[PDB]
Amino acid sequence: GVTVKDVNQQEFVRALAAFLKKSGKLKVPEWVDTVKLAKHKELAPYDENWFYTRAASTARHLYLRGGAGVGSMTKIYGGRQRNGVMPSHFSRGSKSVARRVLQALEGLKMVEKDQDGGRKLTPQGQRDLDRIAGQVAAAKK
Amino acid sequence: RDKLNNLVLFDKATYDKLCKEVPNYKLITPAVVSERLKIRGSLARAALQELLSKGLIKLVSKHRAQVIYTRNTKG
Amino acid sequence: GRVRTKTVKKAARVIIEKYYTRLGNDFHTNKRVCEEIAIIPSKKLRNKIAGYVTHLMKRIQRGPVR
Amino acid sequence: SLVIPEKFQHILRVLNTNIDGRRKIAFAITAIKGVGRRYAHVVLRKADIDLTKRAGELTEDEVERVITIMQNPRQYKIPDWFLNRQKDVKDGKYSQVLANGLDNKLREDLERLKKIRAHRGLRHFWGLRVRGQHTKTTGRRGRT
Amino acid sequence: GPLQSVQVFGRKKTATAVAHCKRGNGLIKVNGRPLEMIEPRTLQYKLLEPVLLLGKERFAGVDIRVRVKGGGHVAQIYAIRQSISKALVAYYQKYVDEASKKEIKDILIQYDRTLLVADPRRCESKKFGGPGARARYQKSYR
Amino acid sequence: QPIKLARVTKVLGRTGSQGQCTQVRVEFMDDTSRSIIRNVKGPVREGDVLTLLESEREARRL
Amino acid sequence: TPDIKLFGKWSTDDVQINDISLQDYIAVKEKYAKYLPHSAGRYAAKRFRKAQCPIVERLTNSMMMHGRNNGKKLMTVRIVKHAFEIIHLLTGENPLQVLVNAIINSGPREDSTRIRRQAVDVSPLRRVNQAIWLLCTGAREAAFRNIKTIAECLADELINAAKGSSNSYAIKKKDELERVAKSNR
Amino acid sequence: MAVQISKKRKFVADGIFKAELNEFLTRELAEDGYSGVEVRVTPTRTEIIILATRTQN
Amino acid sequence: HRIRITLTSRNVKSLEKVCADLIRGAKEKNLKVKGPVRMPTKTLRITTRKTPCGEGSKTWDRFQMRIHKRLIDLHSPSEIVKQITSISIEPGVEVEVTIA
RNA sequence: ACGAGACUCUGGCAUGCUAACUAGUUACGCGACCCCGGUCGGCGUAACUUCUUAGAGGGACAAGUGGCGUUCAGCCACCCGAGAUUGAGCAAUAACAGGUCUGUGAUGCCCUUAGAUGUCCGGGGCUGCACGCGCGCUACACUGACUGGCUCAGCGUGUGCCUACCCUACGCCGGCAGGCGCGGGUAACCCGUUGAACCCCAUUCGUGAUGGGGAUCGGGGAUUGCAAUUAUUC
């Protein structure tokens, strides 16, 4: 048996996003295909069902350290703000795009409001996340 | 100067010269083909996945910055 | 540029002309004699001075120094 | 597929402006003034057209389906904060202006600020920086 | 039985990797995830230096857990290298003969001295009048 | 004209206007008897060998 | 394996250095075999400590040039890695052997200097540094503003320099320095 | 205390305190030979000694 | 009973002799003592131009004030404390007794 | 006698010493999950100080060896070792019509002192644009840009005597800037395990002033402020 840490997160994020295709229970907003994920971005994501990929990434990011609030994910998904003629700086990601995905994974129970604020994933939300790591660990065998 | 007007899509003349000539080159990169067939790099990149699907080229190493192919087994 | 100043050389000759018997030849023990027979304010001087008296021994058994 | 199709349009004369066909569809529309690399993607996402094709393989029966979204973005569920002309000063209608209206709507507001003799309008009449830049050291090229 | 645990640190520029040996089987993982699956994956053989030059059997009866903190990416990789190599030789001196330990350290120092001794290089302080520790601002005449 | 191999025997001193060249007492690996002086560029140790494009040029002693 | 070392997959053995003048300044064999050409460094501490650096590392360091690429060794190690199978899939020879043949055939023997300029021969180490120099700036001139990636232009030049194809940027610069030196001599 | 300022700010404050005494006393007790002060801490009591040449003056 | 005593001081040894002075009176009372907890020191950096005006080569200063802080907590009632607190205290050291 | 050096601080080495419920490790006992074991910044304890913090010490001296040198001062090389030149602060005699009276309740002299060169208020200006020069920032791309994914820092600072003004977690609303609630932190406690970029992995582009570059400029939306037009910033 394997947990998620012995599997490469590169092929582990979109493996869990494939599990979010069979569900289709994610309560996706409608402004999804017309939004720019951060003020420091300039284009919308190329792959259109990006909502299913990052909601998969916020899930595993809650696995390794819980209690993270929407302010923390704006730091997770931040990056260089290429300021044009002025020097670039780090800038946080968008809040609403992060506020919806954790509201979405509370829609279909995979995560709950931790005490002291924040969001930690329920024990059943950790049971199935190894079922995705077990099949890819079996995929390399 | 002299602006390169590469080809964005194959006409059947070049497409003929692809399914025949390139699988015999010792090195297949989207660069070495795009400079020899006078086509863009995206079409060159796109023109090596089917040859990998048809199995007429061998993928030796692909990377974000560099994707390399060669001939098949000679035997 | 490891050249000893006079205050290292001056103090190194005074102990040898006064404690020629208690100090030895190896650096470490006559390092330990120096803090007892001379109050040195720093540790580097304690090693700088002790470093020279050791050098003067293998000049003494080879003959007299002026 | 990678072989070249039939029914080509190397130059799709759209909105009285040429548009290259060798370019990808998401970026060929940017050749039109009033639509940039951002506003072009939401349109090609409003009309479910696949962005993996160049602008010279898409069927012409739906290129106007793209155009009607350019002219009419409101009923196609496009937000107000995407429009290059929000809350017009005359009609206050949230509209997107496209490459011929763009430049004529560009010398209306310029001449409107001149007849009222606004300072911001006179700075355009004289050929100076209007957003309050230091003109002492920069801006020399057109100025002989 | 006996708790043959050795907790050996390895430093780098700022990255500090402290390994934790014990009498287990041959598993080695830093921060819980295995050794070979560590980014950047360009430094793969770098963390395999102690395992390649010494063979797998030297780690067969020793398991290591490494916690790292500080520094940058490659600093952590270079810290983990001379953290688990220092931990293994520190295992073979507390519990078994040095006759084997002296014959395994010479394999490492002959390969690269950094597997055992830390590099005492740190970022020098910036001095005013310039953008760096040595570089100055462009002096202009007239 | 043949090229020859020359093994340095002792470094003499630095020369050149900017002190860029090095004078060396170099000896021919082909026959140790015939030995020459020769100006060289770049850093030179003691015991490394050179590739003279001609042997008959002797560098003036500084 | 305490017995053999492969540069990722390239065997360090059976690499002959024909030119005797440089087999003392080319760390390639039998104690300098490494899996990665990325090491801690310190080779620039004393004067001649640069000689015992593996050349593949010295090829890797001289690639981080021209501003933007400064301090990006993780990118150049990927470059020289990729270049090594490219030459192997374009020559069939051993990558290490081809690199050795190139720096031999690209290091100038003579060089003029201001002492009116006098022609003097170069030291072996300077010759090696100049060799790695020429075939690195050459590939930089080829990949610039060109669809051909930095990996291939690096690959072919040390292929063309290994045989002195006289269309290498290194060789055209090497004989030119040896022609000017042949003039004022 | 009332507003409870931090440890960094308090140590800076008494430095400003000792400074303003020295200047005030240097401008007033100089002709009587003022030569510096020193404060000694005590709960609810701060005694300050004026080291002066002519103590009767 | 669990009381905390804070010792903050600008000078190090004048703190060290007080941080060891409270220990002389506490083992005098033969009760369980907490070891002096060395807190990370705080340094106050102030860099300014040496020049009153803006002329000459640009040179700066490095005014610092490294502050030190030690913690010792004791399991003792209040009257055993306030007899020890009043013994041999130097002005350079500031004591903070926390009853809770 | 001063200056140099010494000295002060800093950097690196001490599984030795002193200590830690505002720092942790390691075990134990539960909890979660996957097939005895594995993972957890999930939860509480007993030992310990490797990791953290900072005190006291120790440590390096050209000390050893081999050459060179009057064999003196020393130099080179090597062995051993964490170092066989870390970095900075301090810094003499004499001097400059160097700068500063726009730092000062440091100041001589001179000028002004009520219709004021005093003080305060309103508005403007210090930014004004044929041109020249100095310090810089962003770039000219493919060793790249774009979009995802992944994964690591260390310096600091933070609620004000006058002072009316802090740093922010978490939860909601909004594309965004931001707004509305609730709490923490006078701080090794909370921000905060400071999930920083670069880099790394994977798409798209394809040598085209191109998805290089982002100057100029239009329209709209916020925030600070008594007040933003000559666009405060966003």
Curated annotation (Swiss-Prot), chain B:
The keyword Ribonucleoprotein applies. The keyword Cytoplasm applies. Keywords: Acetylation, Cytoplasm, Ribonucleoprotein, Ribosomal protein. GO terms for molecular function: structural constituent of ribosome. It is found in: Cytoplasm. The modification N6-acetyllysine is found at K3, K12, K20, K26, K54. One of its GO terms (biological process) is rRNA processing. The modification N6-succinyllysine is found at K12, K54. Belongs to the eukaryotic ribosomal protein eS25 family. Component of the small ribosomal subunit. This is Small ribosomal subunit protein eS25. The gene is RPS25.
Swiss-Prot record, chain C:
Component of the small ribosomal subunit. The ribosome is a large ribonucleoprotein complex responsible for the synthesis of proteins in the cell. Part of the small subunit (SSU) processome, first precursor of the small eukaryotic ribosomal subunit. During the assembly of the SSU processome in the nucleolus, many ribosome biogenesis factors, an RNA chaperone and ribosomal proteins associate with the nascent pre-rRNA and work in concert to generate RNA folding, modifications, rearrangements and cleavage as well as targeted degradation of pre-ribosomal RNA by the RNA exosome. The modification N6-succinyllysine is found at K18. It is found in: Cytoplasm; Nucleus, Nucleolus. The gene is RPS17. Belongs to the eukaryotic ribosomal protein eS17 family. It comes from Oryctolagus cuniculus. The chain holds residues 2 to 67 of 135 of the full protein. Component of the small ribosomal subunit. Part of the small subunit (SSU) processome, composed of more than 70 proteins and the RNA chaperone small nucleolar RNA (snoRNA) U3. This is Small ribosomal subunit protein eS17.
Curated annotation (Swiss-Prot), chain F:
One of its GO terms (molecular function) is structural constituent of ribosome. The modification Phosphoserine is found at S35. GO terms for biological process: cytoplasmic translation; maturation of SSU-rRNA; ribosomal small subunit assembly. It is found in: Cytoplasm, Cytosol; Cytoplasm; Rough endoplasmic reticulum; Nucleus, Nucleolus. One of its GO terms (cellular component) is nucleolus. Keywords: Acetylation, Cytoplasm, Endoplasmic reticulum, Nucleus, Phosphoprotein, Ribonucleoprotein, Ribosomal protein. InterPro entries: NA-bd_OB-fold, Ribosomal_eS28, Ribosomal_eS28_CS. It comes from the Eukaryota. Pfam families: Ribosomal_S28e (PF01200). Component of the small ribosomal subunit. The ribosome is a large ribonucleoprotein complex responsible for the synthesis of proteins in the cell. Part of the small subunit (SSU) processome, first precursor of the small eukaryotic ribosomal subunit. During the assembly of the SSU processome in the nucleolus, many ribosome biogenesis factors, an RNA chaperone and ribosomal proteins associate with the nascent pre-rRNA and work in concert to generate RNA folding, modifications, rearrangements and cleavage as well as targeted degradation of pre-ribosomal RNA by the RNA exosome. Component of the 40S small ribosomal subunit. Part of the small subunit (SSU) processome, composed of more than 70 proteins and the RNA chaperone small nucleolar RNA (snoRNA) U3. PANTHER family: 40S RIBOSOMAL PROTEIN S28 (PTHR10769), SMALL RIBOSOMAL SUBUNIT PROTEIN ES28 (PTHR10769:SF3). The gene is RPS28.
UniProtKB/Swiss-Prot annotation, chain I:
Polyubiquitinated by ZNF598 via 'Lys-63'-linked ubiquitin chains when a ribosome has stalled, initiating the ribosome quality control (RQC) pathway to degrade the potentially detrimental aberrant nascent polypeptide. Deubiquitinated by OTUD3 and USP21, antagonizing ZNF598 activity. Ufmylated by UFL1. Its main location: cytoplasm. It comes from the Eukaryota. The keyword Cytoplasm applies. It is found in: Cytoplasm. Keywords: Acetylation, Cytoplasm, Isopeptide bond, Phosphoprotein, Ribonucleoprotein, Ribosomal protein, Ubl conjugation. The modification N6-acetyllysine is found at K17, K58. GO terms for molecular function: RNA binding; structural constituent of ribosome. Belongs to the universal ribosomal protein uS10 family. Component of the 40S small ribosomal subunit. Component of the small ribosomal subunit. The ribosome is a large ribonucleoprotein complex responsible for the synthesis of proteins in the cell. This is Small ribosomal subunit protein uS10. It comes from Oryctolagus cuniculus (Rabbit).
